[PDB]
Structures are given as C-alpha cells and as structure tokens.
C-alpha cells in the first residue's frame, strides 16, 4: 500500500537510525578482565591522652593489612594492652551479673567476654559478676574517640593503577594514559575540573565526591566504593577507550535496620616477654575500607548480530502495514 | 491454508506464551556489582597437652588474616616454637639419610627442610642425616590433632553483609531487608525454616547445610563456598528483589587424585629477644576458608529484544506451514 | 527466480554452515563462578652483607601476607631496624634543607619523612635540615640491592587449585583432572611440551612463559597475571571441558609514563622491649605479586536462540534476491 512506502521508510530509520547508533546492537559484547594496584601515602599525628604525641605512617602503621585490590585505612581505635592469658571479672551486664558462685557456671559465656569458671568474683567494690578466663584485663567498654585519632587521614592520598583486558578482542589498556608524562604524576592530584587524568586520589575527596564526609565517617568507620567503568567501542580508535571514576558509600548510616554499624575489627600484637610468658596488645580499629570495583563492556562491528537484527527488521515491517491500515481508516 | 490459522495460533502462544513468561526474553540483562563484609564472633577453649587451658578469641587469635570478602577460620594446628636461625639435622628420609659427610652436599636441599651444609650429623643416637642451616629446631613431622583443637568453632557465628548494584539499571540493594528491625538482628541466627532473613549464619550450620560436617572437616581443613544469588526482575517491585543463599564444599575429600588435601598454611610470630637475637614461633594452621561468591542477573522490559524476537516469530511461522503440510497428508 | 534456488542454498549453508559451527549461536551463554587456591613451596638463601648467611622459608618468611586468590612473593628488600618513636633529621632535600630554626615550621612535612618540629638540626657535620618526629632512625635512601636478595625464588614452585561452576547449567569441575594420579602430582611440574596437566608451576617458568625474566624482574618487582580460561561446550562430554593457562606481565616497565615502578610496599615488625618501650623493624619489600585471573563461558543446545536465528535467516534470504538481481543483469 501507499502506507507501505511510509513504513519501509520508518523501519529503515528505526533500525539503522534507532537500534544501531543508539542501542548499538551491531556489536558483540565482551566483559573486562581486571587487576588493580594501590599505593596510599601520607602520615598522621596523634596527641594521645597520656602517651603524648605520636606518628602513624599510613604506610606501615595504618594499613592492616596490605590487600590485593581493596584496602583499609585506619582512622580510629580502642587500644587495650598488657593483656595476658588469665582469669578475670566479666563486664557488668544483667546476663553476666551474679550474687554468688551459684550464678556462674556455658554457651553464653563462650559467646561473651571469655569462658566461664564457676567462681564468682567482684567486678568492683560496688558490684559483682561471673569470673571467666580470657585475655585480661578485658577491653574497656567505651564509644570510640571523637573526633577521630587519625583525622589527618582525610588528607592522605592514594595512587590507583588498573590494568584491564578484554580476552575476546585481544585488547588491553591501563588507566594511566600515554599522553601523561611521569613528571606530572610526581605531584598531580585527581580533580574532576582540572585534572581528570590524574590517577592519584585524595581520601577526603573520594569520600567527599561520594556525597559524604571523611570526618563524620572516620569516627565510626565505613566502606567507600571506588567504581571504575571501562566502556570502549573497539571499532573506534583505542585512544577513545577511557576509564570513568564514580564514588559511593556502601555501608548503611541508619542506626536502625542494621548491625555492626560502620566498619571496624580487632587485631593484636604479640610479644614474647623476657620472662618467657606471653602478652599481647589488643586493638579494635575503626576505619574506611576502600573497595575498587572495576567493570565494563566493549564491542567491535559484526555480521551475525547485524544480519540477525536486520532480518527481524524485515519481519517487523510486515506487521507495520496491518498497524497502519487499522489506524488509517 | 486451514492449518495456517492453527499455526498462527501456535506461534502466538509459542512466543508470548512460551518464550516470554518462561524464558523472559523481552528483557535486557545486567550482571551484579558486588561488595561483601563479614564479622565472625565467638570464642573457643583448648586444653593443650602441657600448656593447660587456653582461650582463642576468633576475633583476633583465630582469623589470619582479616580478609576482603572471604575469610579463614582456624580450627587445628601444629605449633613449633623457640625457632632460630641455626644449623640442624634434617628429618629422617631416604633422600636425607647419609652415612658420612660425603653424602651431604643442593637443589633438593633447598626444596626440603633447609639449605644443605656439607657436614653430616646424627639425627639421633640411632640414625644420621644431612645437616642443614634453617629455622631450628625443625618442625616435628606428625599428623594434626584429632579431634580439632578449636572444635568450638562449629558454634561460632558469622554476620554477612552484602551491598550490590546493577550499573546499567542504576539500581542497588542490600541483603539486609528494611522490614527487619535492628533489635531482631541482636540475636537472630539464620535458618531455612524459621529465619530466612537472618544474615547471621552459624559456621556449623553453613558446613552442614552443604551436606558436610564441621567436625570431620575441621581436623584437616577445607574451603566452604557461600554462594549468594541475586535475581531481580526490575519491572517488578524492587521489594521482590531478594538474595538466595546456597552452600558448597569446594575442596576435594578424596585422598587419591589430589594434592595439599584439605586446607592449611604456615605463618609465624617474630620476637626480638632481650639478648638482641631473633626467635620465632612457627605455626602450621589447618582451618576452613569461607569464600563468599556473589552473582546474579536482572532485567527490565525493552523494545529492541522484544521486536527482535517477535520478528523472528513471524519468520518462524512461515516455515510452520510447510511442516504442517508435510505432516498432514 | 533461478537465483532464488542459489540463494536458498547459500543461506542454508550460511546459517547451519557458518553461524552455527563457527559462531555457535545455537547455545545460551553462562559465565564462570570461580574460586582458587595456591600453595607456594621453596626456600631461599641470602648471604647478607654483615648479618651472614640466612634462610627464608617462602612459606612463612616470604609471603606477606597469605592472600585469598592472588599472592605476593618477596624477592628484594631494604631493612631498617631498631626504629623508635623519636625526633630526628629529615633526608637531604632542597625542600627539607634549612639554614636555621626559621626555615622549619606543615602540610609537606606530614607528606614527607615525618611531622615537622620547628627546631632545625644538622643532618650531618656537612649539612643541615629540618628536624621532625617520626620513626627514627629514618630509612636510608638507596636503590634496592642488585642482584635480588631472594633470587632463589626464580626456582620456587606454586601449586594452583581452581574449582569453578556455571550456576545456570548446574555444572562444575576442577583444574585437576581425574585421569591424573596423586603419585604423579607428588613431583610433577607444569610444562607446555611434556606436562600440560601438571597444576604445579615454577615461578621462573611463569615469568618466563610471559616473555619476561624472573631475574630482571625480581630486583625492582612487578605483577604477573596468571590467566585461566574455562571454555566448555556442555553439549559435548564434560571430559572435553578443560582449562587453558596464559601468562602476562601487568605492570609497566617503561620508566617514563608511570609511577611506583615495579612492585613494593613497606610493613613492619613490632617488639615490646624488655624496657617496656616500643621498637619496630621497618621493611620495604620488592617482589612479584601473582594475580590468578579466572574466566570463561559455556553453552548447551537451545531452541529459543536457534529458532530466533533461523527466523532471521528466512528474512535475510528475502533481500538476497534483490542483491542477486541487481548484481546479475
Ligand atoms: C605533562 O603532563 C601534563 C598533564 O597532562 C601537561 O599539563 C597539561 O597540559 C595542557 C596543555 O598545556 C594544559 O592545558 C593543562 O592545564 C595541563 N594539565 C595540568 C593539570 O597541568 C603537561 O603539559 C605535560 N608536560 C609536558 C611538557 O609534556
Ligand atoms: C522485627 O523483626 C522480626 C523478624 O522479621 C519480627 O519477627 C517476625 O515477625 C512475624 C510476625 O509476627 C512472626 O510471624 C515471625 O515469627 C517473626 N520472625 C521471628 C524469627 O521472630 C518482629 O516482629 C519484628 N519486631 C517488630 C516489633 O517489628
Ligand atoms: C599417573 O599420572 C601420569 C600423568 O598423566 C601418567 O604419566 C603419563 O602417562 C602416559 C602414558 O604412559 C605417558 O605417555 C606420559 O608420558 C605420562 N606423563 C608424564 C609426564 O609422566 C602415569 O602413567 C600415571 N600413573 C599410572 C600408573 O596411572
Ligand atoms: C602487666 O604488666 C605489669 C608489670 O609487669 C604486671 O605487674 C604485676 O602483676 C602481676 C599479676 O598479679 C604480679 O604477678 C606481679 O608480681 C606484679 N609485678 C611484678 C613486679 O612482678 C601486671 O601483672 C601485668 N598485667 C596483667 C595481669 O596482664
Ligand atoms: C631456646 O630457648 C632456650 C632458653 O634460652 C635456649 O637455651 C640454651 O641453648 C643454647 C643453644 O645451644 C645455648 O646457647 C645456651 O647457653 C642454653 N641456655 C642458656 C642458659 O643460655 C635454647 O637454645 C633455645 N633453642 C634454640 C636452639 O632455638
Ligand atoms: C637502638 O638500640 C640501642 C641499644 O639499646 C640504643 O642505645 C643507646 O641509645 C639511646 C638513645 O640516645 C640512649 O638512650 C642509650 O642510653 C644508649 N644505650 C644504652 C646503653 O642505653 C639506641 O638508642 C637505639 N636506637 C634508636 C634511637 O632507635
Ligand atoms: Gd583479597
Ligand atoms: Gd572537615
Ligand atoms: Gd558434631
Ligand atoms: Gd637467569
């Protein structure tokens, strides 16, 4: 029909026009094989209450441990020391509290501060609670310092390297562009406006780019997601293949509707005493774990998907006439 | 033909009926960007042969190290201590055994207990073997304790958080549902029957859910795979987007057809002696490494794949007539 | 037309011939769920300048830390010891150099060797630079030893286990074949020519297979990518499903156009002095990090994609006639 010349003009503009340049269907996909490397640099001062001023080389003292891709920056802490294998009073709790040896005797014990020895002992002159053997003295139940001890970390800076490969199209590139000289990377610092190609990011600015604050986050900790996205049209020059960096808070702020708020964990330092006995320093550290999430797809031109889709274009226009005929009169 | 009205009624029921509601082809795929966090809690008692009763805070003493997603729980061990840099007798082995200094002189040495010094020394009054410098005293060749030292670990419990995102559909959710209050997560424990939405899992129950046993596995160690699966139809409410948890033993039990049976590795503890000399405690730990494997796909409605497939539906029915004609008379 | 019998003979040979056996479109894809395990074995001798001959059990002394999949082998190092919390002279640098207390007073300080105390102190009789509190004595600025301290590592050997699963086709296998006895894996060593099925690889041979050299790489470090590829046609016997191993240097050699050349990082060893004071040994270690990258796809037969494509085959041949008619006369 006369509408058939209109529809044929519509489908030609539909596929070639719509489906190809917009949806780009004429290509075959391939996902990214990725590897990433990070180097945090920076140092941090802390005037501890008693211990006096102290240094923290984010290098060695601040990163437990040195991870594969991701990584965790220490920001806050509760430090218990001179701990040893010994018996001692549980922390004051209605579940731990006792009147005499009769109350202390368990599954919950091993879930709490340590393993319960039947004996009952005074947690202080004022009160009494079940004795347990454990690492003693027990860690003091307190909220983490505020503001953060390693608040200087806002200003630490991380270098992020990222080699990737699309196995299928035997192609591979690195987030560091060849146009970029080494002397520039000697002191550049990423920024969306000025330096998009600087792979050195500032921790504060990472948190911040994410609609967050390194300071209100550094107290109780959290996890920052550093999303890298590799989209490359391989039929285009390999020069136009470029990484986009996005940022995201992953942990939940809301106190309600969650558990283990923020991000922290304990680790220790063991010491062979000159006496031959064991002692350890236990440390509950809060901090920000940065996860580097890499992803992307790519595609060159290809006959099979193209003809596959074009074919469907011709079957589609068949019905287009019935649609035009029912619409028009 | 008359069969053409039958076939057209078949293809309409074939695509819309079969291919769409079953195979759901009318959607576009998107894979999951994932991050996971874990918190193991629990303590464990061990009455060591000589050393007497001892505590092991799965927190600090039990997890080497504190990993990104995955994690490894200590269950069993062989502990060699007071080790130092020094010379000493290899372990009795036909390859190590010697009659005099003539036999000891290598590539295998450096492959064995330590580097071979030519001298030959008696491993005991009864026998003799090549001297080597190494960390000495050498670790005693024995099978790991049975039952497991940290058998209490069956009952440790891990909390598992999992934030995910589909980049394409700018959508993201967390395994912890909003319907779930915090006070519940204060002591809930996952279970298929009662508490499907409790993200706190019990190590025994994880092993167990996998058709295995934490006790027969904890002696010599292994790796548990905790598979999380995120399938979401995004055209449906984001509320129906939910995680399914599956369990799997990854290591091979069979003694034959494998190497490094179960799962263990050695690590050490270094100590600056008051004398200024070095000493270390070497530890071969067996345990269960839990790998959290996250994956899934999703899809909203879309025109391109739909019309693409519908088009093929019309080309398909064309041949359906030749099939009906050859069948019927 | 007469050319229509030619085209129909072309498309039948085009799809069934070209698109199916070559491009294999009649299948549905599924990507790999992977887990990997590694065990490095080997020991290494080092005749240190002063300290004398010394052993390094790649087990405990050589791997910091014991990683999930990937792993890092120590090859070279700069070792600073008896470090303590204290004040001391910065390293000679035009930015650090000073004439008197007036010059020392900062953001750069905290970026450098330590936090600047106003006082100015002589770095030596010859010169003077700003005093800072830090871990002191500062680490000596030198290039890493050459040749590598743990050069013996060329010859260390790693065992690599790899369990994988395609969730969709409920299928899963392991890089260790059932045909392979355990007694063989007791001393086999991978090699392309003789032993393709030996999952024990030699570090030198890994580097080497990659068109590189463990020795010129071990001085300043780098990252080796161990690419495993799982392609399985699941309509074929599950026996033909096999892993291919490829090798790749990931870091950039070129001095220009990069930062943090090679691969190294610092970590420390803490010691409670008999005096009650703290001291630590700081260590900048160069080495080779091996990343095990696993990937692959698979597919069984399927009706939907097949008919989808066949359908497009019939729509395609429609236009083939117009092409043959315009070509031929
Ligand atoms: C090396 O690297 C930098 C970064 O690309 C170059 O600096 C940029 O170059 C252009 C052109 O002059 C300026 O318009 C931009 O402002 C520069 N970016 C920044 C943040 O400095 C620099 O030119 C290069 N050095 C040489 C000599 O090649
Ligand atoms: C908070 O969380 C829990 C878990 O969803 C709620 O307990 C469930 O709610 C229903 C409805 O009463 C019960 O039928 C299920 O047995 C409960 N699950 C378990 C294991 O307890 C609880 O109601 C919530 N608390 C409030 C007050 O909202
Ligand atoms: C156990 O494993 C090995 C490795 O597959 C077998 O050795 C191979 O078997 C064939 C057949 O004789 C030889 O042609 C190859 O040279 C062998 N490979 C190597 C590198 O040795 C060995 O036969 C097996 N042992 C038994 C008894 O089954
Ligand atoms: C940690 O440090 C101090 C100093 O060594 C310990 O001091 C004393 O505590 C002991 C336990 O009751 C007694 O055994 C000692 O005799 C006493 N001091 C001396 C001079 O030996 C203290 O115990 C330690 N704290 C713990 C219990 O972990
Ligand atoms: C580990 O601990 C003990 C106690 O210090 C060591 O005791 C002795 O061993 C030495 C090595 O032959 C001699 O050098 C010493 O004189 C002797 N004891 C004293 C009082 O010094 C023992 O060597 C250590 N074990 C090793 C060798 O690692
Ligand atoms: C590391 O080891 C030595 C040996 O203990 C230290 O020796 C001395 O240094 C001190 C710092 O000025 C003085 O406080 C001491 O009195 C002196 N020796 C003695 C016998 O105490 C040396 O300080 C240490 N190095 C540093 C500063 O880290
Ligand atoms: Gd990791
Ligand atoms: Gd701020
Ligand atoms: Gd049991
Ligand atoms: Gd060599």
């Amino acid at each position: 029909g006369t509408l058939n010349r209109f529809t044929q003009a519509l489908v030609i503009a539909y596929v070639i026009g719509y489906v190809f340049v917009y949806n780009k269907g004429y290509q075959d996909t391939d996902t990214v094989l990725s590897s990433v490397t990070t180097k945090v640099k920076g140092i941090a001062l802390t005037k501890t209450s008693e211990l006096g001023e102290r240094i923290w080389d984010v290098a060695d003292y601040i990163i437990p441990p040195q991870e594969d891709g991701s990584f965790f920056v220490l920001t806050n802490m509760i430090i218990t020391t001179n701990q040893t294998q010994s018996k001692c009073a549980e922390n004051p709790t209605p579940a731990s509290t006792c009147t005499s040896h009769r109350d202390c005797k368990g599954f919950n014990d091993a879930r709490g501060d340590g393993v319960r020895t039947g004996r009952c002992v005074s947690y202080s002159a004022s009160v009494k609670t079940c004795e347990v053997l454990s690492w003693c003295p027990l860690e003091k139940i307190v909220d983490p310092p505020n503001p953060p001890l390693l608040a200087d970390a806002e200003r630490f800076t991380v270098l992020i390297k990222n080699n990737i490969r699309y196995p299928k199209f035997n192609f591979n590139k690195r987030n560091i562009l060849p146009n970029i000289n080494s002397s520039y990377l000697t002191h550049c610092v990423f920024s969306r406006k000025t330096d998009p190609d600087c792979p050195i990011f500032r921790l504060g600015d990472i948190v911040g780019e994410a609609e967050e604050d390194f300071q209100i986050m550094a107290v109780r900790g959290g996890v920052m997601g550093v999303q890298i996205r590799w989209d490359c049209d391989l039929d285009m020059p390999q020069s136009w293949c470029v990484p986009r960096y996005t940022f995201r808070r992953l942990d939940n702020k809301d106190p309600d509707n969650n558990v283990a708020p923020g991000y922290n964990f304990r680790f220790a330092k063991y010491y062979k005493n000159s006496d031959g006995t064991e002692t350890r320093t236990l440390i509950k550290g809060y901090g920000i774990r940065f996860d580097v999430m890499v992803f992307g797809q790519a595609g060159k031109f290809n006959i099979i998907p193209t003809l596959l889709n074009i074919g469907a274009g011709l079957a589609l226009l068949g019905l287009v006439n019935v649609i035009c005929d029912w619409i028009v009169l």
Side-chain angles (χ1 to χ4, degrees), chain A residues 1 6-7 9-22 24-27 30-38 40-49 51-59 61-86 88-101 103-104 106 110 112-115 117-118 120-127 129-154 156-178 180-192 194-237 239-243 245-271 273-296 298-302 305-315 317-319 321 324-325:
Chain A
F6 151 87
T7 64
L10 178 54
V11 302
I12 190 181
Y14 165 85
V15 283
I16 310 179
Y18 166 82
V19 93
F20 290 100
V21 296
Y22 173 89
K24 218 160 197 181
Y26 63 94
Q27 303 174 353
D30 190 27
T31 63
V32 182
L33 197 47
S34 163
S35 173
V36 311
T37 311
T38 74
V40 167
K41 52 165 203 191
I43 97 161
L45 188 49
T46 76
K47 186 189 177 59
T48 47
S49 54
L51 308 74
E53 296 207 319
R54 187 204 204 280
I55 285 218
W56 293 84
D57 52 349
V58 73
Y61 220 115
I62 294 198
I63 310 208
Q66 311 61 27
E67 191 68 318
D68 55 345
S70 320
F71 63 105
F72 165 96
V73 188
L74 196 60
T75 63
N76 225 10
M77 40 174 42
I78 300 182
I79 292 185
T80 335
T81 82
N82 201 22
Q83 275 196 353
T84 65
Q85 291 286 357
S86 198
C88 62
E90 275 187 345
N91 280 317
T93 288
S96 63
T97 305
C98 86
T99 67
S100 51
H101 306 63
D103 304 27
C104 314
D113 313 332
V115 152
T117 169
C120 169
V121 296
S122 43
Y123 163 85
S124 74
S126 305
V127 281
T129 174
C130 285
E131 181 192 51
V132 295
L133 52 80
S134 169
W135 285 108
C136 303
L138 263 303
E139 156 196 319
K140 292 303 169 184
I141 287 178
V142 271
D143 306 9
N146 174 296
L149 270 34
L150 299 308
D152 281 319
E154 192 175 13
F156 294 163
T157 165
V158 51
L159 152 61
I160 294 160
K161 313 190 74 172
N162 174 228
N163 175 359
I164 64 98
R165 165 157 205 268
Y166 302 85
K168 194 175 180 176
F169 314 125
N170 190 9
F171 167 98
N172 45 237
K173 191 165 173 171
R174 315 168 185 209
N175 62 337
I176 296 194
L177 286 56
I180 316 181
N181 37 101
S182 305
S183 303
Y184 168 71
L185 311 183
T186 223
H187 183 73
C188 80
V189 164
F190 174 85
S191 66
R192 190 75 62 197
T194 83
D195 317 329
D197 310 310
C198 190
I200 293 171
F201 306 71
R202 174 163 300 126
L203 291 182
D205 293 350
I206 296 183
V207 175
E209 183 68 7
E211 302 276 299
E212 301 292 337
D213 184 3
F214 198 93
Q215 286 308 297
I216 78 211
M217 184 176 317
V219 52
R220 194 140 298 180
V223 309
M224 270 312 298
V226 184
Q227 311 170 136
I228 302 181
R229 197 193 85 240
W230 286 93
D231 282 353
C232 299
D233 185 350
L234 270 286
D235 63 42
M236 306 297 310
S239 165
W240 293 25
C241 170
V242 158
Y245 304 78
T246 332
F247 301 78
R248 273 211 313 168
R249 161 81 93 98
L250 303 154
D251 49 298
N252 200 2
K253 320 170 182 167
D254 185 15
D256 311 317
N257 189 24
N258 94 320
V259 258
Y263 190 100
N264 78 109
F265 65 76
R266 1 216 163 168
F267 61 89
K269 317 276 276 290
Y270 302 89
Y271 304 116
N273 182 21
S274 309
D275 303 23
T277 57
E278 257 220 338
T279 68
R280 86 157 177 194
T281 293
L282 174 64
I283 299 168
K284 181 185 189 177
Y286 308 74
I288 309 197
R289 200 231 280 171
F290 301 75
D291 278 345
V292 191
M293 276 154 293
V294 182
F295 72 100
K300 285 194 169 180
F301 163 78
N302 198 11
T306 294
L307 304 185
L308 190 283
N309 194 357
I310 293 181
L314 278 48
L317 55 74
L319 196 279
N321 289 348
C324 279
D325 294 352

